[PDB]
Ligand binder design. Structure first.
Ligand code: U20
Ligand code: U20
Ligand code: CL
Ligand code: CL
Lengths: 308, 308
C-alpha cells in the first residue's frame, strides 16, 4: 500500500475534470483515496469599506457552498461506485500557496492536475499556476493532458546522464524506482523506456588550444551516457532495446523522441537548487514543448520555499 | 525626448524578430536607440571535470561570437537605414535575471519582447521567461504578438476602478499619462479607449442579514466605476463614447471587449505588492487570455526583487 493518498487540483473553469478521472483510474487499480481540492475567493472579500465583515462572510460562505456542491456533481458517479473522494474547498486568494500547503500538511503522495492541449500535434499549455506548482511543489506533480491516453502508450523516463554532480544520479534512481513501482501498480504490462539526450560542442576548433579536438568531447559525453544508461537498465531490469541515448538539445530531442515512442507520459527530474541554473532553464523549455503527460519529480533533498 | 532608450529581448529560437521590428517602428517615429539583448550559455560550461577552464572558455567565446553575428544579420537592413542598434550578447544561465539587471543598470525606458499567437482566434502564448519578466521587470513590458498590427487598431487602457486602496488611482493615472504620451509620439491619430470591468455578488440573499440586498452592492460597484471613469476621461481628454464600464469577471470581460474594440494593444497595471494577492491572480488569468499586444506597467513605488 503506497501512493494511497492522492491530491487532485480541480480546474474551476470547466465542468469535466480529467485530473479527477485519472486519480479514479489509479485508485480502482491500487486502492486509496482522493482529495478533490479547490482554493476559491471573490473580489467582494477585499471591498472592506463598501461591505461589512458579515456581508463579505455571507458572500464567502455562498461561494464555498456552491463550489463544494459543483464538485460533488462532477464526482457523483465515482462516489456511487464506492471511490473515496473527500471534497475540500477553502477560501484563499493565492492558489499555488494553498495547494502546496495542502500537500505538505496532509503528506500527499501525488498531485494530479490537468493541462490543456489544443491540437493533436500541439504542446501542453501551462498556466502561471502550473509553473508555480512544477517549480515549488515537493510531491511528484502529474500533469494530465486533456486527451485520451494512447493505446499501448509507453512510459518514458528522461534521465540526466550529462551533469557531473552526484545528486543527479540519486535523482535518476528515484525516477526509475518510482516509475517501476507506480506503473506496475496501475498497469498489468507497463512499457517502460529510458531516454537521455546530450548536445554537442558549439565550436569546431579552439584558437588558443591547438591540440584540442571538440569532436572528442562529443564522443566522451556520448560514452558517459552509454555507461550510465547500461548501469540503470541492469539495475532496473529494462531491456537494452528500450534505452535510448540521443544527440541534440534536450528540450528539442526529448519531446520529439517521446512522440516517436508513443509515450503516454514522460517522467522528469526537476530541482529547487539555485545557482545548476542552466538545468532549470533547459527543463522549463523541455516541459514547455512536451506533447504528452508529464510526471515531475523532485529530489529527496528538496526544500520547499513554502512552509506551514 | 522620452522613451529613447529601448531594450529588445531577442528570441533565440527563430530568425525573424518581431520585438526588434516594433522597436524600429518606434525609433523611426520618436528617435532614440535600441539594445538588442540576448543572454546565452551552453551545457559545456558546467562540465567542469570533463573540460578545462580554457576549453570551456573557447566554447563560451564561440557561442557569443556566433550569436552576435546572427543578430547583426537580422538587424542589417535596419542598421543600413541608420537606426542605432547596439547588439549585446552576454554569458548567463538565468535569462530573466540577466534581462532585468540590464533594465536596472542602463535605465531602459521600455522592454519589448515577442509572444506567439497560433490561431486568429487564439490567446498569446507566454513562456515561463515571459511570466518572470511580467512579474519582476520594473520597466514597462511590451509583449508584441507575432502578427500584423490591425489596421485602425485601438489602444485600450484597462483601469482598476474596483479596489479601494489609493495606490490603484495613482497607477491608473500613470497608465493613461504614459498611453497618451507614447501613443502620440508613435501615431499621428491614436485611438485611445478606457475600459473597466466589475464582477457581481456571488449570492442572492444572506442568511444571517435579512435587510441586505446584494443587488444594491452590484449597483454601487457600477456607480463607483462610472464616477471614476468620468474623472479619468475629463483629466485625459478622452470622449465619453470611448469609455466602457462592463459587468463580469475581468479576466473574461477585458479580453473579450478588447477584441470587440479591435484593440492593437491593451495597457494594464500590475503590481509587486504581496498579500492584494487576488489582484495578481485575476491579472495572470487576464493576461493568459489576451489576444492582442500587452503593455504591462508597474507602479512608481515598485521594488524589484532583483538588484545589481
Ligand atoms: C509512472 C506513471 C505511469 C503509470 C501509468 C499510467 C497509465 C494511465 C492510463 C490511463 C488510461 C485512461 O484511458 C484511463 C481513462 O481515463 O479511461 C476512461 C476512458 O478513456 C473513457 C472513454 O473510453 O471511458 C471512461 O471515462 P468516462 O468519462 O466515460 O467514465 P468515468 O468512469 O471516468 O466517469 C464516470 C461518469 O462520471 C462523469 N464525470 C466524470 C468526471 C467529471 O469531472 N465529471 C463528470 O460528470 C463522467 O462523464 C461519466 O459519465 C474511462 N474512465 C476511467 C476512470 O477508467
Ligand atoms: C501606448 C502604446 C501604444 C502605441 C501605439 C503603437 C502602434 C504600433 C503600430 C505598429 C504598426 C506595424 O504595422 C509596424 C510594422 O511592423 O510595419 C511593418 C509592416 O507590417 C510590414 C508588412 O507590410 O512591412 C514592414 O515590415 P518588413 O519586415 O517587411 O520590413 P522591415 O523594415 O521591418 O524590415 C527590413 C528588412 O529587414 C529584415 N529583417 C527584419 C527583422 C529581423 O529580425 N530580421 C530580418 O531579416 C526584414 O525581413 C526586411 O527585409 C513594416 N516594418 C516597419 C518597421 O515599419
Ligand atoms: Cl493495463
Ligand atoms: Cl500613424
Amino acid at each position: 500500500e503506497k501512493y494511497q493518498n492522492l491530491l487532485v487540483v480541480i480546474d474551476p473553469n470547466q465542468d469535466d475534470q480529467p485530473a479527477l478521472r485519472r486519480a479514479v483510474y489509479i485508485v480502482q487499480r491500487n486502492g486509496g483515496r482522493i482529495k478533490a481540492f479547490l482554493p476559491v475567493y471573490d473580489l467582494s472579500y477585499d471591498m472592506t469599506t463598501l461591505l461589512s465583515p458579515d456581508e463579505r462572510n455571507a458572500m464567502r460562505k455562498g461561494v464555498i457552498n456552491q463550489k463544494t456542491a459543483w464538485i460533488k456533481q462532477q464526482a457523483r458517479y465515482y462516489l456511487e461506485a464506492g471511490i473515496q473522494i473527500d471534497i475540500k474547498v477553502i477560501w484563499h486568494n493565492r492558489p499555488y500557496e494553498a495547494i502546496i500547503e495542502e500537500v505538505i500538511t496532509d503528506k500527499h503522495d501525488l498531485l494530479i492536475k490537468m493541462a490543456h492541449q489544443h491540437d493533436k500535434l500541439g504542446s501542453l499549455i501551462f498556466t502561471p499556476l502550473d509553473w508555480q506548482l512544477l517549480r515549488k511543489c515537493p510531491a511528484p506533480v502529474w500533469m494530465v493532458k486533456d486527451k485520451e491516453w494512447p493505446e499501448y502508450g509507453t512510459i518514458v523516463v528522461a534521465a540526466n546522464l550529462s551533469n557531473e554532480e552526484s545528486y543527479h544520479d540519486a535523482l535518476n534512481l528515484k525516477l526509475i524506482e518510482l516509475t517501476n513501482d507506480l506503473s506496475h501498480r496501475i498497469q498489468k504490462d507497463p512499457d517502460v523506456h529510458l531516454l537521455s539526450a546530450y548536445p554537442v560542442a558549439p565550436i569546431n576548433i579552439a584558437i588558443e588550444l591547438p591540440d584540442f579536438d571538440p569532436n572528442l568531447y562529443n564522443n566522451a559525453l556520448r560514452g558517459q551516457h552509454l555507461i550510465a544508461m547500461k548501469e540503470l537498465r541492469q539495475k532496473f531490469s529494462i531491456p537494452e532495446e528500450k534505452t535510448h541515448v540521443k544527440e541534440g538539445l534536450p528540450e528539442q530531442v526529448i519531446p520529439q523522441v517521446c512522440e516517436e515512442l508513443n509515450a503516454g507520459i514522460v517522467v522528469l527530474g526537476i530541482l529547487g537548487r539555485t545557482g545548476a541554473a542552466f538545468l532549470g532553464n533547459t527543463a522549463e523549455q523541455l516541459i514547455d514543448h512536451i506533447k504528452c503527460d508529464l510526471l515531475a519529480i523532485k529530489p529527496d533533498g528538496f526544500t520547499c520555499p513554502i512552509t506551514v
